[PDB]
Design an enzyme around this catalytic site. Structure first.
Site, PDB file in Angstrom:
ATOM      1  N   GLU A   1      64.870  19.831  53.561  1.00 23.46           N
ATOM      2  CA  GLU A   1      64.994  19.826  55.017  1.00 23.46           C
ATOM      3  C   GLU A   1      63.684  19.950  55.785  1.00 23.46           C
ATOM      4  O   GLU A   1      63.460  19.222  56.755  1.00 23.46           O
ATOM      5  CB  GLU A   1      65.979  20.911  55.463  1.00 23.46           C
ATOM      6  CG  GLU A   1      67.422  20.613  55.051  1.00 23.46           C
ATOM      7  CD  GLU A   1      68.097  19.547  55.909  1.00 23.46           C
ATOM      8  OE1 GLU A   1      67.396  18.742  56.558  1.00 23.46           O
ATOM      9  OE2 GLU A   1      69.343  19.506  55.925  1.00 23.46           O
TER      10      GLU A   1
ATOM     11  N   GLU B   1      54.508  15.311  49.639  1.00 24.50           N
ATOM     12  CA  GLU B   1      55.498  14.418  50.243  1.00 24.50           C
ATOM     13  C   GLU B   1      55.056  13.892  51.601  1.00 24.50           C
ATOM     14  O   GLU B   1      55.180  12.703  51.878  1.00 24.50           O
ATOM     15  CB  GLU B   1      56.847  15.126  50.400  1.00 24.50           C
ATOM     16  CG  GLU B   1      57.599  15.318  49.098  1.00 24.50           C
ATOM     17  CD  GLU B   1      58.899  16.074  49.289  1.00 24.50           C
ATOM     18  OE1 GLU B   1      59.634  16.264  48.299  1.00 24.50           O
ATOM     19  OE2 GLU B   1      59.182  16.483  50.430  1.00 24.50           O
TER      20      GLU B   1
ATOM     21  N   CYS C   1      54.931  30.260  52.033  1.00 20.14           N
ATOM     22  CA  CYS C   1      55.600  29.135  51.378  1.00 20.14           C
ATOM     23  C   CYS C   1      55.128  28.864  49.958  1.00 20.14           C
ATOM     24  O   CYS C   1      54.010  28.397  49.754  1.00 20.14           O
ATOM     25  CB  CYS C   1      55.434  27.870  52.230  1.00 20.14           C
ATOM     26  SG  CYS C   1      56.502  26.534  51.639  1.00 20.14           S
TER      27      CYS C   1
ATOM     28  N   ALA D   1      65.984  24.344  51.350  1.00 23.84           N
ATOM     29  CA  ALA D   1      64.618  24.451  51.852  1.00 23.84           C
ATOM     30  C   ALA D   1      63.743  23.394  51.196  1.00 23.84           C
ATOM     31  O   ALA D   1      62.735  22.972  51.758  1.00 23.84           O
ATOM     32  CB  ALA D   1      64.052  25.837  51.555  1.00 23.84           C
TER      33      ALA D   1
ATOM     34  N   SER E   1      60.789  19.121  54.725  1.00 23.46           N
ATOM     35  CA  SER E   1      60.004  17.921  54.470  1.00 23.46           C
ATOM     36  C   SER E   1      60.547  16.753  55.284  1.00 23.46           C
ATOM     37  O   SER E   1      59.788  15.885  55.712  1.00 23.46           O
ATOM     38  CB  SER E   1      60.004  17.582  52.979  1.00 23.46           C
ATOM     39  OG  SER E   1      59.205  18.517  52.266  1.00 23.46           O
TER      40      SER E   1
HETATM   41  C1  HEM Z   1      56.738  20.985  55.445  1.00 20.89           C
HETATM   42  C2  HEM Z   1      57.603  21.718  54.697  1.00 20.89           C
HETATM   43  C3  HEM Z   1      57.655  23.118  54.594  1.00 20.89           C
HETATM   44  C4  HEM Z   1      57.449  24.060  55.576  1.00 20.89           C
HETATM   45  C5  HEM Z   1      57.078  23.813  57.045  1.00 20.89           C
HETATM   46  C6  HEM Z   1      57.780  25.347  54.989  1.00 20.89           C
HETATM   47  C7  HEM Z   1      57.684  26.568  55.657  1.00 20.89           C
HETATM   48  C8  HEM Z   1      57.940  27.817  55.087  1.00 20.89           C
HETATM   49  C9  HEM Z   1      57.747  29.077  55.770  1.00 20.89           C
HETATM   50  C10 HEM Z   1      57.452  29.226  57.268  1.00 20.89           C
HETATM   51  C11 HEM Z   1      58.012  30.068  54.870  1.00 20.89           C
HETATM   52  C12 HEM Z   1      57.960  31.589  55.085  1.00 20.89           C
HETATM   53  C13 HEM Z   1      59.269  32.072  55.706  1.00 20.89           C
HETATM   54  C14 HEM Z   1      59.271  33.561  56.003  1.00 20.89           C
HETATM   55  O1  HEM Z   1      58.185  34.121  56.258  1.00 20.89           O
HETATM   56  O2  HEM Z   1      60.364  34.167  56.003  1.00 20.89           O
HETATM   57  C15 HEM Z   1      58.401  29.401  53.635  1.00 20.89           C
HETATM   58  C16 HEM Z   1      58.818  30.064  52.488  1.00 20.89           C
HETATM   59  C17 HEM Z   1      59.219  29.454  51.305  1.00 20.89           C
HETATM   60  N1  HEM Z   1      59.295  28.069  51.109  1.00 20.89           N
HETATM   61 FE1  HEM Z   1      58.692  26.644  52.373  1.00 20.89          FE
HETATM   62  N2  HEM Z   1      58.183  25.206  53.659  1.00 20.89           N
HETATM   63  C18 HEM Z   1      58.120  23.836  53.418  1.00 20.89           C
HETATM   64  C19 HEM Z   1      58.504  23.225  52.203  1.00 20.89           C
HETATM   65  C20 HEM Z   1      59.018  23.895  51.095  1.00 20.89           C
HETATM   66  C21 HEM Z   1      59.548  23.241  49.920  1.00 20.89           C
HETATM   67  C22 HEM Z   1      59.461  21.741  49.616  1.00 20.89           C
HETATM   68  C23 HEM Z   1      60.099  24.214  49.121  1.00 20.89           C
HETATM   69  C24 HEM Z   1      60.820  24.102  47.918  1.00 20.89           C
HETATM   70  C25 HEM Z   1      60.886  23.023  47.090  1.00 20.89           C
HETATM   71  C26 HEM Z   1      59.863  25.464  49.805  1.00 20.89           C
HETATM   72  C27 HEM Z   1      60.191  26.718  49.252  1.00 20.89           C
HETATM   73  C28 HEM Z   1      59.921  27.942  49.873  1.00 20.89           C
HETATM   74  C29 HEM Z   1      60.230  29.235  49.304  1.00 20.89           C
HETATM   75  C30 HEM Z   1      60.999  29.505  48.014  1.00 20.89           C
HETATM   76  C31 HEM Z   1      59.780  30.179  50.175  1.00 20.89           C
HETATM   77  C32 HEM Z   1      59.994  31.688  50.033  1.00 20.89           C
HETATM   78  C33 HEM Z   1      58.714  32.460  49.766  1.00 20.89           C
HETATM   79  C34 HEM Z   1      58.944  33.955  49.644  1.00 20.89           C
HETATM   80  O3  HEM Z   1      59.839  34.485  50.331  1.00 20.89           O
HETATM   81  O4  HEM Z   1      58.214  34.599  48.870  1.00 20.89           O
HETATM   82  N3  HEM Z   1      59.212  25.267  51.022  1.00 20.89           N
HETATM   83  N4  HEM Z   1      58.339  28.020  53.766  1.00 20.89           N
HETATM   84  C1  LIG Z   2      70.524  29.094  56.991  1.00 19.98           C
HETATM   85  C2  LIG Z   2      69.420  30.132  56.820  1.00 19.98           C
HETATM   86  C3  LIG Z   2      68.349  29.782  55.753  1.00 19.98           C
HETATM   87  O1  LIG Z   2      67.768  28.507  56.144  1.00 19.98           O
HETATM   88  C4  LIG Z   2      67.388  27.477  55.289  1.00 19.98           C
HETATM   89  O2  LIG Z   2      67.528  27.620  54.060  1.00 19.98           O
HETATM   90  C5  LIG Z   2      66.792  26.170  55.922  1.00 19.98           C
HETATM   91  C6  LIG Z   2      67.595  24.954  55.482  1.00 19.98           C
HETATM   92  C7  LIG Z   2      65.325  26.008  55.549  1.00 19.98           C
HETATM   93  O3  LIG Z   2      64.821  24.785  56.155  1.00 19.98           O
HETATM   94  C8  LIG Z   2      64.440  27.243  55.951  1.00 19.98           C
HETATM   95  C9  LIG Z   2      64.248  27.242  57.498  1.00 19.98           C
HETATM   96  C10 LIG Z   2      63.078  27.181  55.149  1.00 19.98           C
HETATM   97  O4  LIG Z   2      62.395  25.950  55.510  1.00 19.98           O
HETATM   98  C11 LIG Z   2      61.960  28.272  55.163  1.00 19.98           C
HETATM   99  C12 LIG Z   2      61.255  28.470  56.518  1.00 19.98           C
HETATM  100  C13 LIG Z   2      62.632  29.622  54.763  1.00 19.98           C
HETATM  101  C14 LIG Z   2      63.455  29.669  53.413  1.00 19.98           C
HETATM  102  C15 LIG Z   2      62.594  29.243  52.229  1.00 19.98           C
HETATM  103  C16 LIG Z   2      64.078  31.063  53.134  1.00 19.98           C
HETATM  104  O5  LIG Z   2      63.857  31.662  52.080  1.00 19.98           O
HETATM  105  C17 LIG Z   2      64.998  31.647  54.248  1.00 19.98           C
HETATM  106  C18 LIG Z   2      65.552  33.033  53.822  1.00 19.98           C
HETATM  107  C19 LIG Z   2      66.178  30.614  54.532  1.00 19.98           C
HETATM  108  O6  LIG Z   2      66.875  30.363  53.268  1.00 19.98           O
HETATM  109  C20 LIG Z   2      67.254  30.900  55.611  1.00 19.98           C
HETATM  110  C21 LIG Z   2      66.524  31.153  56.965  1.00 19.98           C
END
Ligand code: HEM
Ligand SMILES: CC[C@H]1OC(=O)[C@H](C)[C@@H](O)[C@H](C)[C@@H](O)[C@@H](C)C[C@@H](C)C(=O)[C@H](C)[C@@H](O)[C@H]1C
Length: 403
Positions: A243, A359, A350, A240, A245
């Site tokens: 990808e 980024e 997120c 995550a 980004s």
């Molecule tokens: C443009 C880039 C990004 C987008 C569009 C994005 C989008 C999201 C979204 C939609 C969720 C919530 C998913 C859900 O409700 O199940 C999420 C969760 C999260 N993202 Fe991202 N993300 C981005 C970049 C990143 C990056 C760079 C990292 C890590 C280095 C990251 C780490 C996480 C983590 C750990 C959560 C889990 C939060 C939780 O479950 O409490 N994300 N992200």
């Molecule tokens: C193969 C299934 C998994 O997908 C991935 O890890 C993808 C490579 C990421 O790009 C996903 C889509 C993230 O960007 C966030 C939206 C959600 C992420 C942070 C989670 O915690 C979530 C449980 C995720 O791990 C799974 C859906």
């Protein structure tokens, strides 16, 4: 009648028109995907409500009597592999989610992210330095993909000689093709083995990276990360962590290249770049759909979602709901983007938002600043969009460095 099949071209070709037609009929409708029944939520109000309702679980590991829980995203995954992929924040419900997020938040801070700013800037410059001054290049392979991968590797302490394989496995995982379920599960196993070795190396040779810090993080009340939790969190942070980004940079480049007027505005006023990135995320959300599981019967938008139902919240479709974002199909860097769901909503919001914005802003500013005459190398209508409802993006994008 003709139940929507999420595997059809209708969801990968001018697909936002498809989301619009569904939303207009019922923001919460039954669909078919990967051989199972599910409910697609395309309305903004409905999607926000769904993500805010904890009766809609994020944990694929929970067991229910007589039920076989299957999340589409884990297609082809052996059970043990699923657990390695799903013992982290995004796959946990409270109280577990609460302690995992609190512990990770102690080290994955804005301070740590900002400390990487100089690295993001230098990596970005070096990559742009290598493409030349003219001709055509694939801006994904030469820029959008390598930048985030190098950034997340440095954040997680992944040495240079271990960065040339997981990109391929991750790519196979973004697509959910029943025909390649076995190959997908195998790619998943490689990622697991890769993470197991990474953790082993980091426990043996500590550093100042985020993984090293998570290995030590603790709290009197929340305790600390178990071996399984640490390993699973490291795994998702790795995938995550780059990808989404990569998708943002590629999609953003494509959008700015096809909307001259919008690009012109961002250039004239640098302070407009932050919101431009937000609008790029609102326009074509990388996490187009996010999955939930109905632990209890849940009513969303006046529709009773039966207990044990798989719910696909279409974050992307919600961002195009005209009731929330007027003239939704217009990419407008000046619009009020507040409330879009590309970063989620609620407790799972997120955690990487600060890094993603850093980024996106650094990358786009450098790319278009270095190449003022940059242009698409193919017709806009010929760009190939990744066939994924898990993470939408562009895997190959020809650009002419000198117009
Ligand atoms: C443009 C880039 C990004 C987008 C569009 C994005 C989008 C999201 C979204 C939609 C969720 C919530 C998913 C859900 O409700 O199940 C999420 C969760 C999260 N993202 Fe991202 N993300 C981005 C970049 C990143 C990056 C760079 C990292 C890590 C280095 C990251 C780490 C996480 C983590 C750990 C959560 C889990 C939060 C939780 O479950 O409490 N994300 N992200
Ligand atoms: C193969 C299934 C998994 O997908 C991935 O890890 C993808 C490579 C990421 O790009 C996903 C889509 C993230 O960007 C966030 C939206 C959600 C992420 C942070 C989670 O915690 C979530 C449980 C995720 O791990 C799974 C859906």
């Amino acid at each position: 009648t003709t139940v929507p099949d999420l595997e059809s071209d209708s969801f990968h070709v001018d697909w936002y028109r498809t989301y619009a037609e569904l939303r207009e009929t019922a923001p919460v409708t039954p669909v078919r995907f990967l051989g199972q029944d599910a409910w697609l939520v395309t309305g903004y109000d409905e999607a926000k409500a769904a993500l805010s309702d904890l009766r809609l679980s994020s944990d694929p590991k929970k067991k229910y009597p007589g039920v076989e829980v299957e999340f589409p995203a884990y297609l082809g995954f052996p059970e043990d592999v699923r657990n390695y992929f799903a013992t982290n924040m995004g796959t946990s419900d409270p109280p577990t989610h609460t302690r995992l997020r609190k512990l990770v938040s102690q080290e994955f801070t804005v301070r740590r992210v900002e400390a990487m700013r100089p690295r993001v800037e230098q990596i970005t410059a070096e990559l742009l330095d290598e493409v030349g001054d003219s001709g055509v290049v694939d801006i994904v392979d030469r820029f959008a993909h390598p930048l985030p991968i190098k950034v997340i590797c440095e954040l997680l302490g992944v040495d240079e000689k271990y960065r040339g394989e997981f990109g391929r496995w991750s790519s196979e995982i973004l697509v959910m093709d029943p025909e390649r379920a076995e190959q997908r599960g195998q790619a998943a196993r490689e990622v697991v083995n890769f993470i197991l070795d990474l953790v082993e190396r980091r426990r043996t040779e500590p550093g100042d990276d985020l993984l090293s810090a998570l290995i030590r993080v603790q709290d009197d009340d929340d305790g600390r990360l178990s071996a399984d939790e640490l390993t699973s969190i490291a795994l998702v942070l790795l995938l995550a962590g780059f990808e989404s980004s990569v998708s943002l940079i590629g999609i953003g480049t494509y959008l700015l290249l096809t909307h001259p007027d919008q690009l012109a505005l961002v250039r004239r006023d640098p302070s407009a770049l932050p919101n431009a990135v937000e609008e790029i995320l609102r326009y074509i959300a990388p996490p187009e759909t996010t999955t939930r599981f109905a632990a209890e019967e849940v009513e969303i938008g006046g529709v009773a979602i039966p207990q044990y139902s798989t719910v696909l919240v279409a974050n992307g479709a919600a961002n195009r709901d005209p009731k929330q974002f007027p003239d939704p199909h217009r990419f407008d860097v000046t619009r009020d983007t507040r409330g879009h769901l590309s970063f989620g909503q609620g407790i799972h919001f997120c955690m990487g938002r600060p890094l993603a914005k850093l980024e996106g802003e650094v990358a786009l500013r450098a790319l278009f600043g270095r190449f003022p005459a940059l242009s698409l190398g193919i017709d806009a209508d010929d760009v190939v969009w990744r066939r994924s409802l898990l993470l939408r993006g562009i895997d190959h994008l020809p650009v002419r460095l000198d117009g």
